[PDB]
Amino acid sequence: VVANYENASMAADYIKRVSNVLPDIGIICGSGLGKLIEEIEERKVIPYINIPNFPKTTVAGHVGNLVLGSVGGRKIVAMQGRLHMYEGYSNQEIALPIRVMKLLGVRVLLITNLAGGINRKLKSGDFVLIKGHINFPGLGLNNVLVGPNQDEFGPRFPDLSNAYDRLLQQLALKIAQENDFQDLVHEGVYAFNGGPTYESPDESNMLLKLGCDVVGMSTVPEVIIACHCGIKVLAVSLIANNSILDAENDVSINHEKVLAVAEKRADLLQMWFKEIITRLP
Amino acid sequence: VVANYENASMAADYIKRVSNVLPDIGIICGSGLGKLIEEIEERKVIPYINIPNFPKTTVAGHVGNLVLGSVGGRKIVAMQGRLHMYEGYSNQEIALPIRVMKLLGVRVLLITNLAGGINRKLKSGDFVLIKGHINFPGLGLNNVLVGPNQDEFGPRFPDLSNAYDRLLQQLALKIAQENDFQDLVHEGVYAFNGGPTYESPDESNMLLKLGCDVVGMSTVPEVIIACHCGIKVLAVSLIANNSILDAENDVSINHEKVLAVAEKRADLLQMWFKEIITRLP
Amino acid sequence: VVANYENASMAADYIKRVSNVLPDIGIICGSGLGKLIEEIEERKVIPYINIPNFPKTTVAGHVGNLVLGSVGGRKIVAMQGRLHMYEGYSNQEIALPIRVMKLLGVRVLLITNLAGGINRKLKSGDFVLIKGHINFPGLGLNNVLVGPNQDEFGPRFPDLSNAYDRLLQQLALKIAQENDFQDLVHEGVYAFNGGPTYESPDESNMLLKLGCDVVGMSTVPEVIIACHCGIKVLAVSLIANNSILDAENDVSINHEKVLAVAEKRADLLQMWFKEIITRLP
């Protein structure tokens, strides 16, 4: 199924008929970072399998729902169960849910992920406000926009220089300062490793040379689809480890360690994103 | 349809039957840089849709013709409407028209494109004679030659060290000197960004570190197919902007700005390529 | 055909029924480096075309057999005819034979390849014990593990920090010292160029900047599948040329030159790998 105007329209029509919510904010949350979704008020849960044209997710399994409702007095739509390109989903499957958000009225998209630290200032449990990216898939002919352009959504050749909104980064930092956790908050450049293997020790060393601050396996595809259709983005990485220190000390990384860092920071991140939503212009 | 010997032969047979021209030079022109094609003498226009085994181009639309005739006393074939990999065309679709040129008798291929400047010496409106490349798709398993080798055209493992003919570069520069525009002409290394998003500010900074002079979304696939089958190549980039300066000043780039630079340099480039064709050994 | 537990099991069942050998060591040999396979004792040759679910290899042609038997008193299985990703084989086709090795009982995989030298210490005819890698396909969304995870074989997110076993590297070097050829043996980082074009001169210069010691078109996919399912790996490159020196002197490389270096070192490499097999813990 192509992520075109007609197919996105049919999905949006279904959602409007069952939910009654017209959202202007969308959220996509990293693994272990989804508690805010469970606290959406007056919520409507819409399984992906019930939505016309949504991608089939039964091979990977686990949860896959759109959740609409209110947070901090604002109307939101959340993806509960994220689609990642290392799972084998196509460009069209990743793009369709973001283009549905656009047709529903979304103007701002808030994203979190788990990532490895490259910059030597970064420690496990730190946050990074993403200010730019290095898209290895895109340089290598696997950009999320390879294919015919869908002209109703945006231009053939997008400019990404303002993909990460500067005022949203400033608001996130201001809230951290108000609650005395600004010592955990950095800014940086995100390298997209297609995955699903963690970056090797020698890949980490290369990324240091190339000016990358953090590395992960998500986020950039959704940012590009959002920027193409005019949705503003804030993206925040939670640092699971420093891959450069681990390489120098011969220390390993695993998904269990990543999820334990997520559990340690989950409540703080939930409160931070609730306040960002409340305060958005 | 595979870009094999039998399929290329059937296309070549059709073209010979309708055009009567046996070309020894081929041309592929960048967007806004195609006026020379309209001035081919005693011309025969052959739509792609009429040629056996040529790729289907109706989803993208717009023009798609082969044009044969004479320029400066030499017999040429031009592609009018270029196939780009960011549109979703396969390796086989890109390769077939170049292999048809080979079977028609083409010995030299002349190429122009629009590109972004990385080297700090480069300004909008400058030209770059390409002397080498960094092929991010090829390093990343998206080389145009991935697939079975077509042995009638060339070897399993080509060497690209002489892909950009040195004497053709020297002739192009000599003509610029004769007409007092050599101050616009540089040489450099071309980075292939698969596209269709412009290189991000942080990607531009990375390319500076890695020794790239210019960046664009075309040219390298055709160069590789030509080199594989023994066709000599001259490739020239027209610089639309300096991406490093734009990153330092927070200035944007768009396709409209690119096309306006093309219009400013179109007549000079047309005259330059007509004289190169006339003077080729 | 997916490289899943049921499909690998059916292939393993066939092999057990015809061969009677339960191997604990697997070998994959580079082009021109396969003489050791012909000297396996009490050998059973099983063509790929006869094994349920093995990939079809008739388009490329040439040899394709599994060979089981004894070397130096140990039970081994060899791939005779290697599957390379530049030929167009999918992730699933590359992975299935390694996962069959796992189900047959393989605990150690020994690999050789031909490569180009980047580090200035490396000369034609030298050997490099691989200690890490830079996987350009994997960074660019063409990792061999892209797709659903096969949970019976390994985790969704593997760590590659110990993919190249340190004690196997030490044993290989010790044997070289015992036979007075340690002056030919180096260690280094392997860059995976998807291929099939040799790295361009400007690509070689980039790899020097990024800390790569050698470059080739194989090995990394098999290493990743082996590491995912818990098989230890030793990987050795034979250096065909120094690509940096060749770029500085404008000297070409071709497959004929590569095969002549292979012939010069074939007997030494055969004897070295026979002794490694004999001495493995």
Side-chain angles (χ1 to χ4, degrees), chain A residues 1-5 7-41 43 45-86 88-165 167-281:
Chain A
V1 161
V2 176
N4 64 26
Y5 184 54
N7 292 339
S9 292
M10 176 169 3
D13 189 70
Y14 177 83
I15 292 158
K16 290 186 218 176
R17 286 192 270 105
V18 345
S19 73
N20 223 28
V21 175
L22 286 183
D24 54 19
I25 300 154
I27 70 172
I28 298 175
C29 310
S31 52
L33 307 175
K35 183 54 178 182
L36 180 59
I37 293 172
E38 289 302 298
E39 300 185 357
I40 292 170
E41 300 186 62
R43 75 209 292 259
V45 181
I46 307 175
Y48 296 159
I49 191 166
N50 291 344
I51 304 174
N53 302 134
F54 255 57
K56 177 167 185 186
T57 68
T58 66
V59 173
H62 298 91
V63 69
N65 300 312
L66 277 195
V67 184
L68 291 93
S70 291
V71 175
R74 321 291 296 267
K75 301 296 179 253
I76 77 163
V77 56
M79 291 188 77
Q80 186 177 51
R82 189 182 196 160
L83 307 164
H84 295 105
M85 302 204 64
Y86 57 74
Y89 296 113
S90 73
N91 287 358
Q92 306 292 349
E93 291 175 301
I94 296 303
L96 182 135
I98 309 303
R99 288 177 173 168
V100 173
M101 285 186 182
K102 179 70 188 186
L103 295 188
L104 293 170
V106 168
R107 295 169 64 185
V108 172
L109 177 60
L110 310 179
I111 306 172
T112 63
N113 64 58
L114 284 145
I118 301 294
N119 189 308
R120 287 187 188 268
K121 291 198 188 67
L122 298 177
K123 300 176 183 63
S124 182
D126 286 347
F127 303 109
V128 180
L129 306 180
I130 297 170
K131 68 186 174 66
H133 68 232
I134 295 176
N135 180 10
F136 290 103
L139 292 169
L141 262 178
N142 284 334
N143 196 296
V144 71
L145 287 172
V146 170
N149 189 58
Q150 304 303 331
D151 297 310
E152 294 87 352
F153 289 105
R156 172 75 286 184
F157 306 110
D159 171 24
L160 306 175
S161 66
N162 306 119
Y164 301 93
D165 186 85
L167 296 180
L168 290 182
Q169 292 172 54
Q170 290 162 19
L171 174 62
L173 175 63
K174 184 178 181 180
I175 291 166
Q177 295 166 341
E178 293 168 352
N179 293 281
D180 194 44
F181 68 95
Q182 70 289 339
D183 58 307
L184 304 177
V185 185
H186 296 77
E187 66 173 22
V189 174
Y190 181 98
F192 180 24
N193 168 28
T197 54
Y198 291 108
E199 68 278 5
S200 73
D202 295 289
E203 289 158 7
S204 300
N205 197 25
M206 178 181 73
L207 297 177
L208 181 66
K209 295 178 170 82
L210 298 180
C212 301
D213 296 289
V214 305
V215 56
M217 310 175 192
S218 71
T219 298
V220 168
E222 295 98 313
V223 170
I224 287 172
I225 298 303
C227 187
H228 177 259
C229 70
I231 295 173
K232 298 177 164 177
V233 172
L234 173 71
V236 183
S237 291
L238 171 59
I239 302 307
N241 68 304
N242 190 293
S243 306
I244 290 289
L245 284 191
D246 291 353
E248 292 178 334
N249 295 306
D250 195 15
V251 162
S252 79
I253 183 71
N254 64 61
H255 191 54
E256 294 74 36
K257 289 177 190 186
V258 174
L259 291 183
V261 177
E263 177 47 36
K264 178 180 170 186
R265 292 290 188 231
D267 285 272
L268 182 58
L269 187 62
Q270 173 179 182
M271 290 188 282
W272 194 13
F273 271 55
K274 181 161 74 164
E275 182 73 2
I276 291 163
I277 289 168
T278 304
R279 301 260 293 268
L280 283 172

Side-chain angles (χ1 to χ4, degrees), chain B residues 81 169 214 250 259:
Chain B
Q169 292 172 54
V214 305
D250 195 15
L259 291 183

Side-chain angles (χ1 to χ4, degrees), chain C residues 1-5 7-41 43 45-86 88-165 167-281:
Chain C
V1 161
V2 176
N4 64 26
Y5 184 54
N7 292 339
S9 292
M10 176 169 3
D13 189 70
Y14 177 83
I15 292 158
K16 290 186 218 176
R17 286 192 270 105
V18 345
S19 73
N20 223 28
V21 175
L22 286 183
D24 54 19
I25 300 154
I27 70 172
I28 298 175
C29 310
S31 52
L33 307 175
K35 183 54 178 182
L36 180 59
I37 293 172
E38 289 302 298
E39 300 185 357
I40 292 170
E41 300 186 62
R43 75 209 292 259
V45 181
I46 307 175
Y48 296 159
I49 191 166
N50 291 344
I51 304 174
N53 302 134
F54 255 57
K56 177 167 185 186
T57 68
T58 66
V59 173
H62 298 91
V63 69
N65 300 312
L66 277 195
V67 184
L68 291 93
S70 291
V71 175
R74 321 291 296 267
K75 301 296 179 253
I76 77 163
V77 56
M79 291 188 77
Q80 186 177 51
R82 189 182 196 160
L83 307 164
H84 295 105
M85 302 204 64
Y86 57 74
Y89 296 113
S90 73
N91 287 358
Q92 306 292 349
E93 291 175 301
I94 296 303
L96 182 135
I98 309 303
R99 288 177 173 168
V100 173
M101 285 186 182
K102 179 70 188 186
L103 295 188
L104 293 170
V106 168
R107 295 169 64 185
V108 172
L109 177 60
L110 310 179
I111 306 172
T112 63
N113 64 58
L114 284 145
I118 301 294
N119 189 308
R120 287 187 188 268
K121 291 198 188 67
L122 298 177
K123 300 176 183 63
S124 182
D126 286 347
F127 303 109
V128 180
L129 306 180
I130 297 170
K131 68 186 174 66
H133 68 232
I134 295 176
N135 180 10
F136 290 103
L139 292 169
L141 262 178
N142 284 334
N143 196 296
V144 71
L145 287 172
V146 170
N149 189 58
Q150 304 303 331
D151 297 310
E152 294 87 352
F153 289 105
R156 172 75 286 184
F157 306 110
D159 171 24
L160 306 175
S161 66
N162 306 119
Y164 301 93
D165 186 85
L167 296 180
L168 290 182
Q169 292 172 54
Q170 290 162 19
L171 174 62
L173 175 63
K174 184 178 181 180
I175 291 166
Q177 295 166 341
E178 293 168 352
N179 293 281
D180 194 44
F181 68 95
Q182 70 289 339
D183 58 307
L184 304 177
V185 185
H186 296 77
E187 66 173 22
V189 174
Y190 181 98
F192 180 24
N193 168 28
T197 54
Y198 291 108
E199 68 278 5
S200 73
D202 295 289
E203 289 158 7
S204 300
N205 197 25
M206 178 181 73
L207 297 177
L208 181 66
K209 295 178 170 82
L210 298 180
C212 301
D213 296 289
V214 305
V215 56
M217 310 175 192
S218 71
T219 298
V220 168
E222 295 98 313
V223 170
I224 287 172
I225 298 303
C227 187
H228 177 259
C229 70
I231 295 173
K232 298 177 164 177
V233 172
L234 173 71
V236 183
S237 291
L238 171 59
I239 302 307
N241 68 304
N242 190 293
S243 306
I244 290 289
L245 284 191
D246 291 353
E248 292 178 334
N249 295 306
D250 195 15
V251 162
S252 79
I253 183 71
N254 64 61
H255 191 54
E256 294 74 36
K257 289 177 190 186
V258 174
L259 291 183
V261 177
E263 177 47 36
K264 178 180 170 186
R265 292 290 188 231
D267 285 272
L268 182 58
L269 187 62
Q270 173 179 182
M271 290 188 282
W272 194 13
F273 271 55
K274 181 161 74 164
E275 182 73 2
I276 291 163
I277 289 168
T278 304
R279 301 260 293 268
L280 283 172

